[PDB]
Amino acid sequence: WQENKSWNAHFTEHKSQGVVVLWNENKQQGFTNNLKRANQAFLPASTFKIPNSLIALDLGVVKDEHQVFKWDGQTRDIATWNRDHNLITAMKYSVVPVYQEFARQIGEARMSKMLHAFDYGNEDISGNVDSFWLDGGIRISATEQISFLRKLYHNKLHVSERSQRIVKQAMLTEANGDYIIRAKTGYSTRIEPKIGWWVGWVELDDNVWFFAMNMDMPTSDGLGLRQAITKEVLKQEKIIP
Template sequence: MKFLGSILLTAAVISGILGGCTLNNVDQDDAAATYFKENNLKGTFALLDNVHELFTVYNLKRYRDSAYAPGGTFQLLTTLLGIETGRYLDDKSLITVGTDTVTLGDAFVKGNDAAMAKVAARIGKDTLQYWMDSLHYGKAKMVSDSEQIWKNDSLKITPDEQLGLFAKLYFVKLPFQKRTQQMVRKLMIREDNSLYSLAYKASWDLLPSGKYIGWITGWVEENKHIYFFVINAEPISGRPAQGALIKTAKDILKHYGFFEGKK
């Protein structure tokens, strides 16, 4: 169970909790299977209760042992680096793609692949490679500034690595300026009301193999308690429905009692 040392120790360190987690903290729960099937998906789901160091996972083998192209979730890293390196002043900076102009923040939130590819190219392969290596973000090697390794299946990461990266962003513990992390963390928030706050980055990508891979990673906060979640999935058949990832995530989180302000 080496993955426990990866995500749970990471969570303990970034939240200032001392002491490790034992197998008693891990709940393998198949309840999520129903919601995956209802949305024509198969995959894995994990939920980390950072306050109590409790970890719930569906399909442990896929969560722990499988790695997949990050696709559009790689935009988290490119957005951070775009601001951190000074290529872009902030999330309001403009990107021109053809005859269209969008802000960096909008490109990230809406998953504008063409705009974000321009951001990655402007950052440059050497800088991207340096930070991928420093953050232990997969093991791919970029060969050109225009190479989109995040969706050509040469770069692969595990759900565990995804969850750890987004948790570090929430706690502003990535090796970037505080301003940069807070700016991007704010872009993650999709719902914010008196009961809860929900933040996530989601993407569907068609890989060169012809296979669709989907990710949704983020956090939900209620009563000042923070919980991190990740879904890695693929369609059971055909093309994935556009809203399948967020619907599955919200269905599962609702099953566990979220969105009522009682967690």
């Protein structure tokens, strides 16, 4: 992991603090504005929807990306959560209660064994079965998210090829004639420090660039900056126009 402090310009500019980590798959070389924070492990929060999805599909808790998970009737503070969802929309709107129920169905023994198979962060599921990635013992760094995502990208995780392809579909965030981004956002707020994440990758015609970023996120006002700052860095490195 090579250090490039000049990306801090983009954080300073927006009165923010964080790290971006990039990984050039073809050259097998990684870059970050801050080596220490790149390796600092945090609660994954909604970024956990990646592994949680893989596990739920592999075990048949989720049958496919069209199966409907009916709203439980409880109205919650994000409006999009109060309605029926499938896997695609549950990821898009980051619908926690839908993933809490997958987690209960998975159960702590299958969950722990899967997270060891995935080498996922510290591999510790201490806490409630349905919230450990929000306020429990699990921790992962920006560099460990990249390691994990690379395996997903190559269908190398110990779940079916099919589960992996479905999750990569459900990760689709943006695409045009220049690139494809598959990614997941997250916002850790239950346990200090409040931080925002975006992890995933950019597919080009002849390379892929993995990314993982996190940043201080005192309130939800600055969440747009997860993507905006990442993209500023991608632009600076000529990955996207």
